[PDB]
Design goal:
Layout: H1 2-20, E1 25-32, E2 35-42, E3 57-59, H2 64-77, H3 104-108, H4 127-136, E4 146-147, H5 151-165, H6 169-180, E5 186-187, H7 217-221, E6 224-226, H8 227-238, H9 245-252, E7 256-261, E8 264-266, E9 271-274, H10 279-285, H11 288-292, E10 295-296, E11 298-305, E12 310-318, E13 321-328, E14 333-339, H12 345-360
Antiparallel strand pairs: 1-2, 1-14, 3-6, 4-10, 5-6, 7-8, 7-11, 8-9, 9-12, 12-13, 13-14
Bound molecules: the ligand *C(=O)[C@@H]1[C@H](NS(=O)(=O)O)CCN1C(=O)NCCCCNC and chloride ion.
Amino acid sequence: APADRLKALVDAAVQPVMKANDIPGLAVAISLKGEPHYFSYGLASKEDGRRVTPETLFEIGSVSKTFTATLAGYALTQDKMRLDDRASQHWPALQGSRFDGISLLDLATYTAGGLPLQFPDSVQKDQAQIRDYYRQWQPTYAPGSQRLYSNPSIGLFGYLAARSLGQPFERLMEQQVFPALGLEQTHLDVPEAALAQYAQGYGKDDRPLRVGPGPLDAEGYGVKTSAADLLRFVDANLHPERLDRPWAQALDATHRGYYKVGDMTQGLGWEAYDWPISLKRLQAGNSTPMALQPHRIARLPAPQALEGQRLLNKTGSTNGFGAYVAFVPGRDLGLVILANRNYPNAERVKIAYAILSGLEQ
Ligand SMILES: *C(=O)[C@@H]1[C@H](NS(=O)(=O)O)CCN1C(=O)NCCCCNC
Ligand SMILES: [Cl-]
């Protein structure tokens, strides 16, 4: 009954959403009562007929930011930076710029004062161009006042964390962060030998899409991983105490909230909600206006532990893929939904909510 019921529940949540959104391939991984469960649907590639499995690599887009936050948590952990450091403390090129007056915390939580969703098209993946972009940028409003969701914001936070550790961001992730977390199917740059696992992405008229190079791509949206590895990361988040202390502390640093916007409390990478909450509210928290419009923040008097009866989550996309991760610390419950189409966030949340609701029931 239990195995049959869980399959029944996940199939029921997933299958209509896949059909309705014309999703070629979708992987689910659920952590429940200390055990992983995988459900794989459809095709990693429509053209070669490769099936989705729990080891298929998907682009997770902005979910990468939770890994970036973990690296930053490590640098914090290790007293190499503080959240109240000025950005320009960690990059001489920024001294004399507006980043003299913006904190690492502002950058991590999108309150630096109007850094946009993405780098402009004119900024290529080039150290000098990135440097020059930040040097010339001016806040639209006072740092610390408004949240505007931004790749250049948290991207810079990740880059500066790497600088504080004295190594390239990409090298730190490959050589330190991924091994510490036990992740052998998680990549910024997929090895040639593992490319057979890399799903095709699909956009309009099913054109094939895989993510290309962009400025601060590793920090903002660089990770390709499997449902099995992403669930391993969720399990590390559910039980940081199971990791060696330096990494336990790094993960804990991503479970601290600094302010609220509506129903959402903003942490490093993770965004949190009270749990239970209605599906419509959780969808609103992950809606297009949240990503695209500035919102005045409600600052907390002290950082808040994002634990107990809460749902922590992150959406992420690339042109060809759509990812969603959600976990409930107080229930030892986590889930990962990875697809090779960029389909609406509301639909991702709908699948997850149906699974979580069914598990409670
Ligand atoms: C991350 O996935 C961000 C946005 N995150 S979300 O929470 O709003 O879903 C969605 C699109 N994002 C992203 O990184 N896109 C990748 C394309 C990079 C293009 N920059 C030139
Ligand atoms: Cl960007």
